Amino acid sequence: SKEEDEKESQRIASKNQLESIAYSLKNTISEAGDKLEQADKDTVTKKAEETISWLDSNTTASKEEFDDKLKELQDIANPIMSKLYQAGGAPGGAAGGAPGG
Description:
It is found in: Cytoplasm; Secreted, Cell wall. Belongs to the heat shock protein 70 family. Binds human HTN3/histatin-5, a peptide from saliva, and mediates its fungicidal activity. Interacts with polyadenylate-binding protein PAB1 and Hsp70 chaperone SSA1 on translating ribosomes. Interacts with NAP1. This protein is an all-alpha fold. The chain has a single domain, classed as Substrate Binding Domain Of Dnak, Chain:A, Domain 2 (Up-down Bundle), CATH 1.20.1270.10. The protein has helices at 2-29, 38-57, 63-88. Helix 1 (2-29) packs antiparallel against helix 2, helix 1 runs parallel beside helix 3 and helix 2 (38-57) packs antiparallel against helix 3 (63-88).
């Protein structure tokens, strides 16, 4: 039937893009050396690698599940990306706006 083909091709796209994003998270940390702390940096990249391992282990999951992984990856990465950006990643003017303290 067409149904399986449709779903499979989407699962492929989902795997591919999710995989790419995991590498993108680590790629971002590659310039984040002094900009991020070792703990949050390890947290995102470790999770990214877990994400890569998850894809290989759960290739048998549907694209909804790959989306789910993408979402939870993005959720945890979001604040850490944000702290990266508001330092020297997001355009502020001089530098990233410090929260004060």
